[model samples]
Target chain A: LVAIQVEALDRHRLLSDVTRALADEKVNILSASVTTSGDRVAISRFTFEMGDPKHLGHLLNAVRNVEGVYDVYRVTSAA
Target chain B: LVAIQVEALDRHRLLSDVTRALADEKVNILSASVTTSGDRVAISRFTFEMGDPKHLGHLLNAVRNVEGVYDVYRVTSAA
Candidate 1:
C-alpha cells in the first residue's frame, strides 16, 4: 500500500493541490484524510496501484517546494 | 452523530488514552482517525448515538487536562 503524507499550512489549498496532483497523475485516491494540529495540516492519500511511488515522491517533492509545506513523505506499510 | 476532536502529542499513548477514555464513557466508536504531523498528533472519534455532545465535550475537556494535549473540540455537523 502506498500512502502520501504531507504537512500543509493552508488546509483548503493543500487538499486541493494534493488531490489535483494525484488526479493529474491519473492516480485514483481510494481513501484520504486531511487533519490539522495547531497551525499545521497533514494529509494522507491512499491510492490504487498504477504509477511508481518514486515518481509520486517526485511529485510530493514538487509539492514540498510549494509555499507553506512543512514536510512530505511516503508511508510504506509492511503488508 | 457526535465527533470528538483532540490534538495529542504522543501518538501511541494518545490513542491508548483516548480509546480508554471512550470505553470509560461506554461510548461505542463507529469510526475514528488518528493522524500525526511533525511532533503533533490529531484524533477524531465518531461514536454511536448514546450520549449528548455536551457530555462528550466534558469528557474531552478532561482529556485536555491530560498532559501533551493542545486542544480539544467537537465537530457538530449540520445534518
Candidate 2:
C-alpha cells in the first residue's frame, strides 16, 4: 500500500497533472482525493501500487515539476 | 456550480455508488474527494453541475439509499 500527499498552488488541471505523474511512473491508483477551500492552496491525497520503490523519487519529482506544484510527498494511506 | 457532501459507513464500491448516483442524475462533476481515516466512517465531497434544481431531492435520496450511506447534503463548491 503506497500513498502520497500533495500541497500546491491551485490551478486548472492540477488534479489531472498529479494523477498523470503517477501514471507515468506506472503506478496504479487505488483511491484518491483532491480538494481546495476558497483558497488557492490545494491538497491531494492518493493511494496506489508501485512495483519499484526507487521510482518513488522520480514520481515525486515529476509531480513537483508540474506547473504550480509546490510540494509532493508520500504518506501512510490515501484514506 | 453545485456541490454536495456525503458521510457514511465505509464499504467497498461506496465511491462508485455515490458517483453513479450523480451520473444518473446527469450531474457533471467538476471535482470530488473521498476519504476514510482508519475508521468505519467515510466522507465524500463532490462538486457538480445539475440543470434541474428540483432533482436535488432525488439526488440526495439516491445517495442516502446507497448501502451504508447515512447522510447526504449539498455544499457550496467542489473545491
Candidate 3:
C-alpha cells in the first residue's frame, strides 16, 4: 500500500474532495485518517494500492488542485 | 515523537473524542492523519510527545473508551 499524507486547512468536504481525486485514479483505498489540534488545520493520511503506477503523477496533481490543501507527502516507512 | 495507530468505526466527533483523551493525559500532539476507503472504517495515526511516559497506559485506555473505537496500537517504526 502507498501511504500519502496531506496537510490543509480544515473545511467542509475537504476530505471528500481529496479522496475523490485519489479514487478517480483507480487507487484502492484501504484506510483514511484525519487529525487536528483544534487549530483548524487538518492532516490526513491515506493508504491505498495504485492500480496503475503510471497514474501516480496525475493522481498527485489532482490532489494538489483541491482548494484549502497545502502540502502532500509520501510516508517512506512501511512494514 | 511517539506514533500510535487506532482503528475504529467512522463516527461524528470521533477524532475530537480521541484527541481530547490524549490531551487530557498530557500528550503533545504533533500531527494526526485519517484515511478511509468508503467503508465507514477509520484508521487514525497520531504522532506526539509524551509529556509523561507513565501516562501511556491510562492514555491508551482512555482512547479505547471512546465510542466506535476498537483498536489502539503503537507504530513500531520511527526515523
Candidate 4:
C-alpha cells in the first residue's frame, strides 16, 4: 500500500482535482480523508495502489503539479 | 530539507531511539515534534537535511529498522 498526503489552500475543488489526477493515472485509492484547519488550509491523506509501482514518482509529480497544492509526501509501512 | 513522520507504540525510548538512528547516519535534524494519542501511540514529525542526498533512502530504511517504528514517510515542498 502507498500513503500520500497533500496540503493546499482550502478550496472546493482541491479534493476532486487530486482524486481526478490519480484516476487519470489508473491508480486505485483504497482509503482517503481530508481535514481543513481554521478554514484556510486543507490537508488530505490517501492510501492507494498503482498498477505499476514504477509509476510512483510520476504520480507524485502529477499531484504536486495541481494548483493550490503546496506539499506532497509518500508514506510506507515499516517492514 | 526533508520532512519525516514516524508512528510507533508509545514507549519511554521511542523518540530517543529514532533520533539516535538519524544521528548515527549523520543526518542533521532541523526541527521535530512529538504527539501521543490516547497514551498508546506516539507520532513524531521531523524536518531534516542530509550531507549527501543519496543517503536519504538509506536513512529512511535505518529509521524503519529501529524497533517499534510502524511507518515512515518523506515529505517535500511543492514548487
Q: Rank the candidates by lDDT, best first.
A: 2, 3, 4, 1
Steric clash pairs (candidate 1): none
Single out the weakest 10-residue window by summed lDDT for candidate 2 chain A. A11-20
Model 1 chain B weakest 10-residue run by lDDT: B41-50
TM-score of candidate 2 versus the correct structure, residues matched by position: 0.52
RMSD of each: 14.2, 7.0, 8.7, 15.7
lDDT values for all models? 0.56, 0.68, 0.67, 0.66
Number of the predicted model whose lDDT against the real structure is largest: 2
Q: For candidate 3, what is the TM-score?
A: 0.49
lDDT tens per residue, model 1, A1-77: 57766666633344445545666665544444545555345444443344565767678677777666787777668
- What DockQ does candidate 4 score? 0.02
How far is B70's C-alpha from truth in model 1 (Å)?
37
For model 4, which pairs clash? Answer: none
Please state the error at residue A30 of candidate 2 in Å. Answer: 7.4
Kindly report which residue stretches of model 1 are placed more than 4 angstroms away from their true locations once superposed. A43-48, A51-54, B1-79
In model 4, state the lDDT of residue B10. Answer: 71
Over the stretch B1-79, how does candidate 1's per-residue lDDT look in tens digits? 5565667674444544554555565454443455555545544443334357687557767887777777777766886
Q: Over the stretch A1-79, how does candidate 3's per-residue lDDT look in tens digits?
A: 6778877786435654565555454355565666673688877776666566667676677678889898889765847
Give the 10-residue window scoring lowest on summed lDDT in candidate 1 chain A.
A39-48
Interface DockQ of candidate 1: 0.03
RMSD versus native structure for model 3: 8.7
DockQ of each: 0.03, 0.14, 0.14, 0.02
